[PDB]
Structure 1
Amino acid sequence: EMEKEFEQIDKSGSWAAIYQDIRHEASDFPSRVAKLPKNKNRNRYRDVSPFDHSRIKLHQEDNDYINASLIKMEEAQRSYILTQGPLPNTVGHFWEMVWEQKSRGVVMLNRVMEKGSLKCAQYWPQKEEKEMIFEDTNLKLTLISEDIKSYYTVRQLELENLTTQETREILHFHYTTWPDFGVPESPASFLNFLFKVRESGSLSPEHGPVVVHCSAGIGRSGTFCLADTCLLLMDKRKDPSSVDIKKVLLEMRKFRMGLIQTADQLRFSYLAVIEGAKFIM
């Protein structure tokens, strides 16, 4: 059981060592499409690429590329799209992907500015009466409502396909309090946030996969999916303590490289799952 494993690694301070074994065991697949020179300005970080086998393809004939990966967790019946924070020139691609994949929710785990640099383009409208048009992908986006709480903001958005005049409601879940450095002290507000996304229906098989992003789409985004999948497997299995976080992380790393960036994020993922298990048992 992971509670005992947590105390062991913690008391022995072996987090950097566990983390290195995961790094060495992790899959490596080709990322040829990401490295094409025509896609250079579609990537925020040159060292963070989707694998060709799991990459999301845009349905535009010109260039189908976006830095986004489909993570398919077969046993848990959960899918997620993990992507980078959009760039100024990829905001239209981002919303085209949301439209094409029939996603109901967008989960954002970063602020637009952190450590005095831009981590993400401002890709949603700030006021009801100032809608955004993406001319390149023929989509209109309107802020319908905004509910600001202490740790997170939920926004209702209307996305309209200008080509067909269909409209969908998208929920934007914005976790606003992840610190500039390190991880939250307690996983309580992160768990609260995860239960709010679950309650919305955004993670349900009726809809396309939820879109999850931070700046690179591997660190905080990784923590989100890892905690959700681990807690769901504890509901589903005859023996809840058969759930090995390290195994789940390695299975997720077959779909996108680098998920969980630091030993601190690994420790925080254990803590979130251990604490979340109390609300689930």
Structure 2
Amino acid sequence: EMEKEFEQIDKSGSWAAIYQDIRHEASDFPCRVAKLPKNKNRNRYRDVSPFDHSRIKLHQEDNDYINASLIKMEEAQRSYILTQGPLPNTCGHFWEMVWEQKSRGVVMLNRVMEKGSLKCAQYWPQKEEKEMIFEDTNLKLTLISEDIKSYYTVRQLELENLTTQETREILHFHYTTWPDFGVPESPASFLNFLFKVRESGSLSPEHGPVVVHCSAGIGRSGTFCLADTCLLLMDKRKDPSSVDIKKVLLEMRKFRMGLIQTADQLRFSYLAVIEGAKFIMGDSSVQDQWKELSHED
């Protein structure tokens, strides 16, 4: 069973060794476009770039580049777009991507300001009477409402293509207490949040891929997507213990570099998937238990 393996690794203190094996076996593909001198100011970090083969292209004749990758999980039957936290000059690009890809939801796992340094730009309106307009991409964003919780906030936003005047409702899921290179507080808090995104219907195949991002778009976002995909797999092959988390992660890194940034986030991923498995195979009360333990109120 999954628990026995998790316990064996914990006992021998091998999480750092497993994580290191992952970095060494991980795919390596070119990122030429990301490295073009003209795209230098479109990347938040120097050594974090989307692979050329899976990068998301903007539908604009000028510069189609944005630091975002399309993670397509064939067997699990789900796609996610992982991107960095928008910079002061790429907020228009960010929303242009949401529109063109037809995304229904956006998942933010970092904070605009963490420990002083600006870890991300304020790309969505904080007050309803203050809509935002992105002149470069000709888009309008309005805060329709928001439900604030102890560790996460869900916002309803209206995105409008000012060119065609078409309107779309975007759901914003902001996890506010997940530190850089850190982990969520308990599997219950994480899963409670993950299931909030699921039930909203934002991850449905009827919509474009959900856009997920943290600061660099690989650590926290990698953890969120790995857990979701694994819970998806062990509900599909109805033989959960066959799902090899390490292999799933390596499959994901084929689409974007450095997913999961610490040995501890890897361990958490196992903890979250194991705890989440309870639901996937029977228990229809553990969800309330998670909401209970999460202390979202």
Using the alignment, how far apart are the partners of 2:35 and 2:262 within structure 1?
25
**Aligned in 2, Cα 1:21/1:78: closer, same or farther, shift over 3 Å?**
same
Q: 8 Å contact 1:42–1:89 — kept in the other structure?
A: yes
Say if 2:151 and 2:177, in contact at 8 Å, map to a contact too: yes
Aligned to 1:271: 271
Secondary structure, counterpart of 1:39 in structure 2: helix
Deviation, structure 1 residue 116? 1.1
Q: What is the TM-score with the length of structure 2 in the denominator?
A: 0.93
1: CA distance, partners of 2:99 / 2:227: 26
More off after superposition, 44-53 vs 233-242? 233-242
- After superposition, give the CA deviation of every residue in 1:24-48 in whole Å (9 maximum; x if it has no partner): 1100000000000000000000100
Distance 1:230 1:132 in 2: 37
Q: CA deviation at 1:236?
A: 0.5
Residue 115 (structure 1) shift: 1.8
8 Å contact from structure 2 (residues 54, 70) kept in 1: yes
Q: 1:117 to 1:154 in 2, by over 3 A?
A: same
How far did 1:4 drift?
Answer: 1.5
Equivalents in 1 of 2:123, 2:182: separation in Å?
26
Contact in 2 for aligned 1:15/1:263 (Cα 8 Å): yes
Per-residue deviation at 1:278? 1.2
Q: Note the C-alpha offset of 1:241.
A: 0.9
Q: Is the 8 A contact 1:112 1:118 kept in 2?
A: yes
Secondary structure, aligned partner of 1:208: coil
Q: CA deviation at 1:142?
A: 0.2
Question: What's the CA shift for 1:255?
Answer: 0.1
TM-score, with structure 1 as normaliser? 0.98
After TM superposition, the runs of 4+ consecutive aligned structure 1 residues lying more than 4 A away are none
Do the aligned residues in 2 keep the contact of 1:227 with 1:273 (CA within 8 Å)? yes
The answer to whether the Cα contact below 8 Å between 1:115 and 1:180 also exists between their aligned partners in 2 is: no
**Distance in structure 2 (CA, Å) of the matches to 1:181 and 1:20:** 16
Structure 1 CA distance for aligned equivalents of residues 83 and 123 of structure 2 = 14
Question: Are residues 252 and 181 of structure 1, via their aligned partners in 2, closer, same or farther at CA, if it must alter by over 3 Å?
Answer: closer
What's the CA shift for 1:218? 0.2
1:190–1:261 CA distance, 2 compared to 1 (3 A) = same
User: % of aligned pairs identical?
Assistant: 99
Query: What is the CA-CA distance between 1:235 and the residue it aligns to?
Result: 0.8
CA positional deviation for 1:240: 1.4
Shift of 1:2: 2.8
- Quote how far apart the aligned CAs of 1:238 are: 3.1
Distance 1:188 1:179 in 2: 17
Shift of residue 181, structure 1, vs aligned partner: 5.9
Given that 2:108 and 2:212 are in contact with CA atoms closer than 8 Å, whether structure 1 keeps it comes out as yes
Q: 1:31-73: CA deviations, max 9, x gaps?
A: 0000000000000001000000000000000100000000000
1:180: Cα distance to partner? Answer: 5.2
Which ranges in structure 2 are unaligned for 5 or more consecutive residues? Answer: 282-297
Q: Take 1:225 and 1:46, find their aligned partners in 2: how far apart are those partners?
A: 23
TM-aligned CA deviation for residue 185 of structure 1? 4.1
Distance in 1 of aligned mates of 2:180 and 2:26: 27
> Quick one: distance in 2 between partners of 1:263 and 1:20?
8
**CA distance in structure 1 between the partners assigned to 2:155 and 2:161 by the alignment:** 19
Deviations 1:232-260 (A, max 9, x none): 11110031111000010000000000000
- Cα offset, 1:182, TM superposition: 2.7
8 Å contact kept, 2:110–2:179: no
- Offset of 1:186 from its aligned partner? 1.1
Contact 1:2 1:244 in 2 (8 A): no
CA 1:247–1:101 in 2, change beyond 3 Å: closer, same or farther? Answer: same
SS in 2 for 1:229: helix
Q: Take 2:107 and 2:117, find their aligned partners in 1: how far apart are those partners?
A: 21
C-alpha displacement of 1:88:
0.1
Partner in structure 2 of residue 189 of structure 1:
189
State the distance in 1 between where 2:238 and 2:106 align. Answer: 32
CA distance in 2, matches of 1:37, 1:2: 47
**1:59-111 per-position Cα deviation (integer Å, ceiling 9, x unaligned):** 00010000000000011110000000000000000000000000000000011
Cα contact 2:76–2:233 (8 A) shared by 1: yes
Contact 2:108/2:174 (8 A) holds in 1: yes
Shift of 1:184: 2.8
Aligned to 1:177: 177
Cα deviation, residue 187, structure 1: 1.3
